[PDB]
Amino acid sequence: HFEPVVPLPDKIEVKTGEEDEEEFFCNRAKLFRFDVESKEWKERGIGNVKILRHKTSGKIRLLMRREQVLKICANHYISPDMKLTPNAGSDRSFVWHALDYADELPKPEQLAIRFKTPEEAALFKCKFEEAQSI
Amino acid sequence: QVQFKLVLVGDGGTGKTTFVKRHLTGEFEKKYVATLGVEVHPLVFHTNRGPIKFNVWDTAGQEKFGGLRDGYYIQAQCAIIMFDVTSRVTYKNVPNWHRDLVRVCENIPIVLCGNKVDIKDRKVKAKSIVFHRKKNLQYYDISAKSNYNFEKPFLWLARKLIGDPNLEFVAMPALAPPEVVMDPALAAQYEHDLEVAQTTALPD
Numbered sequence A: 001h002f003e004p005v006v007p008l009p010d011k012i013e014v015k016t017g018e019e020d021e022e023e024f025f026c027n028r029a030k031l032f033r034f035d036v037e038s039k040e041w042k043e044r045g046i047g048n049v050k051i052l053r054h055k056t057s058g059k060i061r062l063l064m065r066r067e068q069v070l071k072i073c074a075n076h077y078i079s080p081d082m083k084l085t086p087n088a089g090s091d092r093s094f095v096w097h098a099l100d101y102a103d104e105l106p107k108p109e110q111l112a113i114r115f116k117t118p119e120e121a122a123l124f125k126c127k128f129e130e131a132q133s134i
Numbered sequence B: 001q002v003q004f005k006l007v008l009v010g011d012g013g014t015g016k017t018t019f020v021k022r023h024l025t026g027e028f029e030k031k032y033v034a035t036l037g038v039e040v041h042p043l044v045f046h047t048n049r050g051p052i053k054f055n056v057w058d059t060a061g062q063e064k065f066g067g068l069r070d071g072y073y074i075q076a077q078c079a080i081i082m083f084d085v086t087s088r089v090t091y092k093n094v095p096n097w098h099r100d101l102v103r104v105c106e107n108i109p110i111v112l113c114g115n116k117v118d119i120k121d122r123k124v125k126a127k128s129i130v131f132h133r134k135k136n137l138q139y140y141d142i143s144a145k146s147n148y149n150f151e152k153p154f155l156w157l158a159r160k161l162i163g164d165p166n167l168e169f170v171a172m173p174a175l176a177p178p179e180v181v182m183d184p185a186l187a188a189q190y191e192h193d194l195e196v197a198q199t200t201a202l203p204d
Ligand SMILES: Nc1nc2c(ncn2[C@@H]2O[C@H](COP(=O)(O)OP(=O)(O)NP(=O)(O)O)[C@@H](O)[C@H]2O)c(=O)[nH]1
Pocket: B010, B011, B012, B013, B014, B015, B016, B017, B018, B019, B029, B030, B031, B032, B033, B034, B035, B059, B060, B061, B062, B115, B116, B117, B118, B119, B142, B143, B144, B145, B146
């Protein structure tokens, strides 16, 4: 037992910033951010990539979170400028550039997402683009 | 604002840095690059009683630093003592660190972590671990390579620090991002330079 140092913080209306949107798509995958600082590709996260369109505003974004700890690792809005190009023929993963906000600070990271199977990638591709068709 | 000083100590090679740099980037550093006498990065965890920030003093391991790692210790509020489990030596030294800690800042919550439990050829067997029992320290198997339990350490501490035995980590407010329009040359170029990337084989 250790006496607490900081005064007890009241509970919270545990948000989630989710809602007000609906899952236009949601599959788990692994995320990668490029380094440039070197040239190696880095593991950014593992969990569910979602595609949410606001109920009101109608603004579709791509929110990814990490399992276990649950932390955003993708947050940008899908744009018509973004083009999910394959990657070394890897029909299970794609790469696109995005002014992501996963850290709550805008950073123009080049990304890569890889899926367990191709069907899953294909579906992601479709739904992703279908979300641009709007 | 809720913040705590966390000093991560332990024989180099044990993964202390790889641990923290994963909770920070979600990246896994395969290569060894010794920490030159402490490095500090902050870690944030969103809980039911609000979010908390962990100021992590990722210290060095090579004894060549034995001196300075006392100032790193001043006013620390909790620490994670870590050892390799794949290198019994590390475990052997454990009791040493526990001392250095209780030297400058007595009591204080401390978690003992046996990292790398992802590797098959385990050497520091489960029943081998005992110090945590004799020293009354929360212990957990970790694996910065498989994220295995990698949150339990902080969670355990959080609770101790705050006072809510039931405090719990819970997702993370997915706040609204920034607005960036205009395609012109803008997105047209973003394309070219992107070639440089996808031309770099993907990890795994
Ligand atoms: N497979 C596996 N490798 C790990 C794990 N944790 C980290 N590593 C490996 O541990 C090696 C060295 O660990 P690192 O964090 O760099 O050292 P440290 O513990 O910080 N020592 P110091 O900072 O004192 O110099 C790296 O090559 C990294 O690949 C783990 O859970 N298992």
